């Protein structure tokens, strides 16, 4: 059925947009020292998984949740900082800059691929309506 | 919640003492660390300086 392709590709587009948004947020806040609660900015990551509940193996993509990374927060020595711990260490984000740049580019590419899939399926469905004049 | 913006703020200033040059002037005065001179501000208020 070509109609379900609309839902599949729309889900893919939304998920990749969310992934690119997460990557952009990580890139922007790579040097943030604090948040509103005084906690360091932890790198965010989306969780991709299929959505084929009505008895299928393939159904597209959906973002289950956004999770903060468990890699070690970078400790910088600064004793004058109000946020420094007992040893004088301040926690800083664990953002991987090269990783987030590659994530941005890859998300853009797969987003574009899904755009092309949607356009092709729309063209095919348009051509179908002229079956036998 | 995927969008996290960033804003640039200035959390106070740096109070590390600076360089001290020796000008043979009896009026030039330097203060010990964490010490401030007191002046009368423009708006009739009280201001502290180094």
């Amino acid at each position: 059925a070509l109609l379900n392709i609309f839902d599949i590709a729309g889900s893919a587009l939304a998920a990749q947009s969310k992934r690119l948004n997460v990557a952009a947020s990580n890139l922007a806040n790579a040097d943030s020292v604090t948040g509103p609660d005084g906690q360091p900015y932890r790198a965010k990551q989306v969780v991709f998984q299929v959505d084929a509940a009505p008895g299928q193996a393939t159904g597209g993509v959906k973002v289950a949740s956004v999770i903060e990374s468990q890699a070690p927060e970078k400790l910088v020595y600064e004793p004058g900082n109000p946020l420094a711990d007992a040893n004088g260490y301040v926690k800083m984000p664990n953002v991987d800059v090269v990783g987030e740049m590659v994530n941005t580019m890859s998300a853009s590419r797969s987003y574009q691929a899904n755009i092309e899939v949607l356009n092709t399926v729309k063209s095919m469905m348009l051509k179908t309506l002229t079956l036998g004049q | 919640a995927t969008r996290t913006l960033v804003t640039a703020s200035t959390p106070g200033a740096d109070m590390t003492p600076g360089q001290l040059d020796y000008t043979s002037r009896p009026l030039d005065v330097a203060l010990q660390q964490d010490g401030w001179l007191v002046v009368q501000a423009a708006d009739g208020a009280e201001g502290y300086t180094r």
Binding site: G10, S11, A14, P36, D37 | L5, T7, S9
Partner: peptide, 21 residues
């Protein structure tokens, strides 16, 4: 509240505070 669905109630207004107070 599944994203992309339709709900009778309007979405709550989002807020981005710089300080908790």
């Amino acid at each position: 509240g599944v994203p992309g669905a339709l709900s009778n109630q309007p979405a709550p207004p989002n807020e981005a505070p710089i300080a908790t107070p």
